[PDB]
Amino acid sequence: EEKETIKINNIMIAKYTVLYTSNCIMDIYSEEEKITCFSNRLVFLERGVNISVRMQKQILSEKPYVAFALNGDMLRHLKDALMIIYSMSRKIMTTEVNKTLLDELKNINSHDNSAFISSLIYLISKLENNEKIIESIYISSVSFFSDKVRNLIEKDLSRKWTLGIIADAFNASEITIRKRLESENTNFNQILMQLRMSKAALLLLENSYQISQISNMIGISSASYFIRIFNKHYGVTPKQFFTYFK
Template structure:
C-alpha cells in the first residue's frame, strides 16, 4: 500500500500536481494495482485499479511536462445503482468509456465511494501521435488542434474493455516491459481512433467548462430516466441553451445525437438485465419503457446482431 501511494506522489510531481492539499484524502484510496510507465518524451502511462472508501475530488491543473499533448483516460467502472445516483455533475459513466482532452485543460479528478475503477491513463505528445496515425491524421484533425478547448467521451468497445482489464490485472512485470506497455498503449489508441471514425459528423468548436458541465447534466439525467425519454422542453431547460446548440455540443462531446445516445444506453442496460437478472425479454422491455416489444426486439438486434432471446441464450450463464 505504501509503495502505491509513493508511486502516486511521484506521478503527481512529474505532472506538476500538488497532493499536499488532499493528503488525507489520498489515504482513502485502496490500490489493487498501480504502475507508472515513463516512456517520455513521447508518452507517460499510468495503470491503476483502486477503490476509495469515501467520495472526493481534486482539480488537475494543466500539465506542463509535455508542451502539446492529449490526456486519454480509459475506464472500466464497477458500481452499484445506489452509488451511481450519488455521483455529481460530470458523473462517472457506468459504461466502460474513454475521455480525451488536451493536456493544457484543467479538469476534475473524481474518486467516488466504493466504486472499483480500472483505469489506463495515457499522456501522449501530439507530434508523436500524428506520426503514429500517419496519412490518416486528417480524418481526426480536430484532435490535433489543441488550442481549442475540447472534451470528448466515447464508449469503449469490448476489445478496449478487455485490454484495460488485462493491463489492470497484470501481477508481474513483463520481459521488455517498456516495449510491452508502449505496444499496448498504442493498441488502445488505435482501437479508440477506430471508434471515433464511426462518429456522427459534426463541426468541432471551442467549448467552455460551463458548456461541458451542461451537456453532462443532460447526459446524466437521460441515464437516470431510461424508462421514459425526456421531452425537448425538458432537455432545453436542463442544458440552459437553445435546442440547436445543445444538440450540436452533445454530439461533439459524445459522438451521437441525444436520442441515439438514449437508445444506446437503453440497449446496454437491456443486455445487462438479460445477462445478469432472471428476467424474461418482455419483462426487460417493459422495464425500459417499451410498450411495443417488436420494436424493442428490432432495436436490440440492430445493436447486438441477435434477437434478445437468442442473445440471452448465448450470453446468460
C-alpha cells in the first residue's frame, strides 16, 4: 500500500488548467496515449479532456502539485488577447520551468484578473513551440453543445434530470440530443455523473463538509451510495482521495 502513489480514473478537466508538478511524477493516460510529467515541470491541460492519472509523490506531507485553473472569463479574455498578439499530444503539454519563469509562477495572484492574464501572457511568450498551447487555449475557449448541457445541469445539480428534460429545454428531440452529445464523445448520463463527481471531489478537498452533506449537495440520496459511486468512478475511496491531496 504505497501512500506516495495513487491511480485515479475518469478525471474531467473542467477548466483550462496549468499545473506545476511541485511534488510528484505524473503519468497521464487518455485514449491509449501516455504523457509523463516529471518533477518540476509545467503542465498544460486542455479544458474538456478525460484522463486517468498515476501519481507518485516524492514527499508525502505536501500536496502532489500546484495548479492554476482558469474560469470562463479568464479563458476567453486570454483567447482574445492571444489572438490579438499572435490527438492527445496536442491537448496535454509539459515543459521545464526556469528560475525566471518559476519566479513568475511564485507571484501569481488569483484575485487580480488583469495581473493574472498578463502573467500567463508573459509565460507563454517564453516557451518554445508555443503554438500547441495557443491552439488548446483557443480550442478550449469554444463552448461545445455538451457545455450547454453542462451549464443547464450545473444550475440545479440536485434535480432528477432526464434526457427528456434536456431535449425539451433545447427545443429538440431526444435522439437529436444524444446524437449531438455523441458527436462530442459523451452522453447525457456521463455528463451528469461527471458533474456530480467533479463537484464532490472539490467539496472533499475543502475539508469543511461531511460526506453525507457532500452527497446531499450533489444530489445523491445516501452517503453510502455516494461512497460506492465515487470509488467506482475514480478508483479510490473519498477517504483515500482526500488523504492523498490533503
